[PDB]
């Protein structure tokens, strides 16, 4: 049971890593800028 729990932990780690790369790709694809951060005549 201890060995199976270790294998589960490795699988959860790689799943979280894939999730965070998908999130950085999503925030790369959609970028939102504040109107206070944009210039008034721009």
């Amino acid at each position: 049971a201890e060995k199976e729990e270790k294998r589960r932990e490795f699988e959860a780690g790689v799943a979280a890593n894939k999730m965070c790369l998908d999130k950085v790709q999503e925030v790369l694809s959609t970028h939102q800028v504040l109107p206070q951060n944009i210039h008034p005549m721009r």
Binding site: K23, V24, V27, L28
Partner: protein
């Protein structure tokens, strides 16, 4: 806080600013050329007055 923590995002926002600057300075070149054309027609006009 995700945007402040990422770094590839910082790389992309460093690149896109340069991609903007290229087009800005290109149309600035176009502005400089039209000012030069204005100076040329000024010189022709003043030569006509001399004649």
């Amino acid at each position: 806080q995700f945007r402040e923590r990422c770094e590839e995002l910082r790389v992309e926002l460093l690149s896109i600013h340069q991609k903007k600057v290229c087009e800005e300075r290109k149309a600035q070149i176009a502005f400089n050329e039209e000012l030069s054309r204005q100076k040329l027609v000024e010189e022709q006009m003043f030569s006509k007055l001399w004649e």
